[PDB]
Enzyme design. Structure first.
Site, PDB file in Angstrom:
ATOM      1  N   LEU A  15      87.780   9.432 128.224  1.00  0.00           N
ATOM      2  CA  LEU A  15      88.788   9.613 129.275  1.00  0.00           C
ATOM      3  C   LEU A  15      89.961   8.645 129.135  1.00  0.00           C
ATOM      4  O   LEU A  15      91.063   8.958 129.583  1.00  0.00           O
ATOM      5  CB  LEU A  15      88.166   9.437 130.669  1.00  0.00           C
ATOM      6  CG  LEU A  15      87.098  10.450 131.084  1.00  0.00           C
ATOM      7  CD1 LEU A  15      86.363   9.976 132.327  1.00  0.00           C
ATOM      8  CD2 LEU A  15      87.709  11.826 131.301  1.00  0.00           C
ATOM      9  N   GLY A  16      89.723   7.471 128.545  1.00  0.00           N
ATOM     10  CA  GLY A  16      90.775   6.461 128.360  1.00  0.00           C
ATOM     11  C   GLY A  16      90.257   5.129 127.840  1.00  0.00           C
ATOM     12  O   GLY A  16      89.145   5.043 127.311  1.00  0.00           O
ATOM     13  N   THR A  17      86.330   1.271 126.831  1.00  0.00           N
ATOM     14  CA  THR A  17      86.666   2.689 126.989  1.00  0.00           C
ATOM     15  C   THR A  17      85.845   3.350 128.113  1.00  0.00           C
ATOM     16  O   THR A  17      84.719   2.937 128.388  1.00  0.00           O
ATOM     17  CB  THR A  17      86.448   3.468 125.671  1.00  0.00           C
ATOM     18  OG1 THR A  17      85.054   3.750 125.487  1.00  0.00           O
ATOM     19  CG2 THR A  17      86.975   2.658 124.465  1.00  0.00           C
ATOM     20  N   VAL A  18      86.417   4.380 128.738  1.00  0.00           N
ATOM     21  CA  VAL A  18      85.728   5.151 129.787  1.00  0.00           C
ATOM     22  C   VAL A  18      85.427   6.550 129.261  1.00  0.00           C
ATOM     23  O   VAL A  18      86.342   7.224 128.779  1.00  0.00           O
ATOM     24  CB  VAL A  18      86.583   5.242 131.066  1.00  0.00           C
ATOM     25  CG1 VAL A  18      85.833   5.975 132.187  1.00  0.00           C
ATOM     26  CG2 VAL A  18      87.002   3.842 131.514  1.00  0.00           C
ATOM     27  N   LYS A  35      81.975   3.115 131.762  1.00  0.00           N
ATOM     28  CA  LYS A  35      82.849   2.110 131.159  1.00  0.00           C
ATOM     29  C   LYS A  35      82.045   1.380 130.099  1.00  0.00           C
ATOM     30  O   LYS A  35      81.050   0.744 130.416  1.00  0.00           O
ATOM     31  CB  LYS A  35      83.356   1.120 132.216  1.00  0.00           C
ATOM     32  CG  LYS A  35      84.261   0.015 131.676  1.00  0.00           C
ATOM     33  CD  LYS A  35      84.913  -0.736 132.823  1.00  0.00           C
ATOM     34  CE  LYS A  35      85.753  -1.907 132.334  1.00  0.00           C
ATOM     35  NZ  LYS A  35      86.479  -2.582 133.452  1.00  0.00           N
ATOM     36  N   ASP A 122      94.206  -5.594 142.289  1.00  0.00           N
ATOM     37  CA  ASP A 122      94.810  -4.614 141.387  1.00  0.00           C
ATOM     38  C   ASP A 122      94.954  -3.241 142.069  1.00  0.00           C
ATOM     39  O   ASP A 122      94.663  -2.218 141.486  1.00  0.00           O
ATOM     40  CB  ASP A 122      93.964  -4.502 140.120  1.00  0.00           C
ATOM     41  CG  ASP A 122      94.740  -3.917 138.933  1.00  0.00           C
ATOM     42  OD1 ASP A 122      95.968  -3.715 139.039  1.00  0.00           O
ATOM     43  OD2 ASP A 122      94.091  -3.635 137.915  1.00  0.00           O
TER      44      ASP A 122
END
Ligand SMILES: CS(=O)(=O)c1ccc(Nc2nc(N[C@H]3CCCC[C@@H]3N)nc3cc[nH]c(=O)c23)cc1
EC number: 2.7.10.2
Length: 263
Positions: A15-16, A17-18, A35, A122
């Site tokens: 997905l993006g 590590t994820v 994750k 954040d």
């Protein structure tokens, strides 16, 4: 809680590590976001899991557990629609009422976080995940801190991977992070949301944002944003910490406005 690797199936893509995966529960399989740590960086993932394990709220991403194998892995519930800013950028038909609904949900999760004496540090539209178009969850607790029982802020030392455009002046000037500084971030998030995922302070460096804010200047009212919502944004951007509202007041403001729209 430690998870059993042989009950976890991962997707090869990321997905993006994820990455997306599946965790076998007793009779059902749960879709999960994982994750995975690229092999004191260990300790940060553990810190993040330690915060998520203490939180239990519908508007906060739930942790399932940690799985030690091959890589270290933080297993969490899946929010399929992904980050709020990306969703709204691709879905410009989403109506004002809906946006109000989603930011109100964020404010409810943040009210709870404030009550629990955690600072997020954040908070941004990128770290709000959509389960559905009408259900938002706060994510990304990697920078989050549990406040001591005798204090209302966390004092950092010179961290520099900072999302300056989301940070309150006292964070930049004195390294002091509180639920009130999260409120500032929430104002930026609101602006982002009503702007359908536009980046804030476009084209500006951190120092230029700090300078803009010090002159008392603030980002303008997004197109189609109800003025009461822009007023609330500006209230979140109160320079003086002590005069800036907490999430109790922000959530209450949004709640009433939302149910005024529903009425
Ligand atoms: C392909 S997409 O852009 O539509 C999409 C991106 C991310 C997700 N989900 C998640 N992302 C992330 N982390 C990052 C991924 C990169 C964009 C910013 C996110 N905060 N953490 C978590 C944690 C728990 N549960 C999650 O679902 C999750 C779902 C869809």
């Amino acid at each position: 809680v430690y998870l059993d690797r042989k009950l976890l199936t991962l997707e090869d893509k990321e997905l993006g590590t994820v990455k997306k995966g599946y965790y076998q529960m007793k009779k059902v399989v749960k879709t999960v976001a994982v994750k995975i740590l690229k092999n004191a960086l260990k300790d940060e993932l553990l810190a993040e899991a330690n915060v998520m394990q203490q939180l239990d709220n519908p508007y906060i991403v739930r942790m399932i557990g940690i799985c030690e194998a091959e890589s270290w892995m933080l297993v969490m519930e899946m929010a399929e629609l992904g980050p709020l800013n990306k969703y709204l950028q691709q879905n410009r038909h989403v109506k004002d009422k809906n946006i109000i609904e989603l930011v109100h949900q964020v404010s409810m999760g943040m009210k709870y976080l404030e009550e629990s004496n955690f600072v997020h540090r954040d908070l941004a539209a990128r770290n709000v995940l959509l389960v559905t178009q009408h259900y938002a969850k706060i994510s990304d607790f990697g920078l989050s801190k549990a406040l001591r029982a005798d204090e209302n802020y966390y004092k950092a030392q010179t961290h520099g991977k900072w999302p300056v455009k989301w940070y309150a002046p006292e964070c930049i000037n004195y390294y002091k992070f509180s639920s009130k500084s999260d409120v500032w971030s929430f104002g930026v998030l609101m602006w982002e949301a009503f702007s359908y995922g536009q980046k804030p302070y476009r084209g500006m460096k951190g120092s230029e944002v700090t300078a803009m804010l010090e002159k008392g200047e603030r980002m303008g009212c997004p197109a189609g944003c109800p003025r009461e919502m822009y007023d609330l944004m500006n209230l979140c951007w109160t320079y003086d910490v002590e005069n800036r509202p907490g999430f109790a007041a922000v959530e209450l403001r949004l709640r009433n406005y939302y149910y005024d729209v529903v009425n």
